[PDB]
Symmetry: C3
Subunit: 232 residues, 3 copies
């Protein structure tokens, strides 16, 4: 529900964090707080791997449009910063993170999805940075998140042309790693997480950092300079 | 024709620039001048998007071989510089640029094609940097153009091995973004351009620059140091 | 055989170097020495292109596990250094290098494979950096080798998740360039090498260096600092 938008469930060697705000899983302050608290739970439980899911309608429609279009600049910037901080937290997470993309993933929803080690979606789910289409220049933090995953040509189209990807085109582009039928997206993600929990955790954590260090530093710059994009 | 190699046609929200020198659309001085004048026209008309096409035989066979093999170094270097300047102009263009690859695109023809935001070709059209095959080391400006679009492994083969791509292999590699039947390549490119004209133009222009800044600077270096590759 | 693990055969414009230690072509000191001596032969014979093959069981199972798990640090580090030096030698080789991946390629076997200009494998052959799975953090030299060839998303999974690729997934990822049936892998590699020998050799050598300079420097750093990864 809107006031209780995240659930946390431990299943043996994994933890499953599910977003369902009863709508489109907007990544506002309350959702970010709930997600950070759920990841805190995973930290305390020292789980072997993390699964993050959306609901039956979407993975996430991205940042909360209401806060963005409210005329109040500061809450908007804090929300953006918190969202990209969460992305940074997941990208640098010391356990394997598997995303269960259970519906469309748009804008920050797509950026968030792109922070999983392994991403599972169904063929019919749209993944898109629609920012340019609706009149927003893509923040550097979001650009660097996408740049880490998208092929060179997909990165060009996804950004400048707000291109929509799905299924085989998303897989080819690097917006997802695996396609499954809608009814087994979550199950496949859990199965994958259980497998990755069998990897050596220390080598995994060290290796993923080595494979991402440059992007993490650029994302950090994008987070810290976010206000400056808007002249604040 | 050879003396009148470019046409410019405004269609509602787009402008269509067509190369047809009656042969292989060689990118010599007269062609570059005509293309720059056509883009000047688009600038004055402030169109929503640009389509650039070849003729029924090729997109372009690249730089004019006659000028290259004439024994006169300076016209050769000026032609190269002008060609890569045109590439830079298109890559940084503030409106969406759609390439209608209406036949083969070889060497500078392929480099030029790689400057469109969206590239449409038919399955049978060869796209190739044949430089290494014919005894030329690829200029840095051309390397950086390709590096921005080609997957890591395609970039290796396209350069060092002068590999030819087409259709599905070109799409996979990042030498094109869309495949269409020969008879609708131009129509599909126009349709795409009309769509992209509906994107927010300011966000598009800003975002494409952010997504290309490093490549643009490297291409600029390649242009400015072009003479130095040949010890001049 | 184990004591005579490499053969060198000149065929017209190419040389064929075949690994067969009677087992899994482990890249220990004796194998590295034999390979370097075979490449020395190719240097003296000034061949048009190089083909490197495995045996009927594998391309290579990577570094010699016995030396790695012997409790003696220095032979282990020398072996690693020599292996990555060989990789560097092949990546910077002035003639086209074609890999005939005649079976699985695991860990350094996969890193070695990734040093060919053109890589041919059969659909059933596994290619995997299994380091994270078995408890090793991937060395920087190996990371940079893979980074030069793998798509952005394949690079993430191949490293942090020790993902196994094969056939179409290897081709898509950039772990190979061509798939052939097992019985013609070597023949196809030879045919390709003969073709590449027809490229202009000077332009090939210059162009491949330009297309790899950054990676070569990073690999060199990884080689020279290899001891430092282990605090030596
Ligand atoms: C850099 C940063 O990313 C900056 C930005 O945020 S730029 C803005 C990017 N965000 C968007 O444009 C929003 C994306 N939303 C969507 O694409 C679609 O709504 C969707 C695919 C998620 C859902 O599609 P669809 O099922 O057709 O539902 P749709 O009719 O569009 O809207 C569903 C409801 O959710 C609301 N909603 C949708 N997305 C929302 C969001 N991000 N925040 C708040 N509310 C949202 C709608 O206003 C509508 O509300 P209502 O039922 O109470 O009227
Ligand atoms: C860094 C820079 O890129 C440096 C360089 O330019 S390196 C040189 C790269 N360019 C080339 O090698 C040229 C590429 N050309 C081609 O690949 C092929 O000609 C093509 C695919 C474009 C056309 O193929 P095809 O239809 O078989 O025509 P083909 O017989 O080759 O030649 C067509 C005619 O155009 C000419 N021509 C072809 N390409 C030309 C070019 N770039 N400039 C001038 N003339 C050219 C031919 O000489 C022939 O002329 P003719 O009819 O008057 O004799
Ligand atoms: C950074 C660096 O890469 C650091 C590292 O080396 S980390 C370690 C990475 N290496 C490995 O884990 C080894 C990889 N090996 C394999 O994956 C598999 O053995 C293989 C696919 C190559 C062969 O599989 P399979 O046919 O099932 O044979 P398998 O039963 O595993 O072993 C075959 C035999 O070769 C041995 N062997 C396998 N790989 C070996 C290696 N790299 N070195 C030495 N011996 C090896 C086995 O111990 C066994 O020996 P035996 O017949 O005398 O008992």
């Amino acid at each position: 529900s809107m006031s209780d938008p995240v659930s946390y469930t431990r299943k043996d060697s994994i933890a499953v964090i599910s977003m369902d705000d009863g709508k489109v899983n907007a990544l506002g302050p309350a959702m970010q707080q709930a997600l950070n608290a759920a990841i805190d739970n995973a930290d305390r439980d020292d789980v072997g791997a993390l699964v993050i899911t959306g609901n039956g309608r979407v993975f996430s429609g991205g940042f909360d449009l209401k806060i963005l279009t409210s005329g109040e600049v500061q809450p908007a910037i804090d929300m953006l910063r918190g969202g990209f901080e969460l992305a940074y937290r997941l990208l640098s997470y010391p356990k394997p993170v598997v995303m269960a993309c259970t519906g469309h993933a748009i804008a920050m929803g797509a950026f968030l999805l792109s922070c999983g080690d392994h991403r599972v979606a169904a063929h019919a789910y749209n993944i898109q940075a629609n920012e340019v289409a609706i009149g927003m220049t893509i923040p550097y933090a979001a650009l660097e998140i996408m740049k880490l995953r998208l092929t060179r040509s997909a990165y060009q189209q996804a950004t400048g042309l707000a291109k929509t990807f799905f299924g085989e085109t998303a897989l080819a582009a690097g917006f997802i790693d695996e396609i499954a039928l809608p009814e087994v997206v979550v199950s496949r993600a859990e199965e994958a997480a259980r497998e990755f929990a069998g990897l050596n955790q220390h080598a995994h954590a060290a290796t993923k950092l080595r494979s991402r260090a440059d992007a993490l530093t650029a994302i950090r710059a994008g987070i810290d300079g976010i206000a400056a994009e808007f002249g604040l």
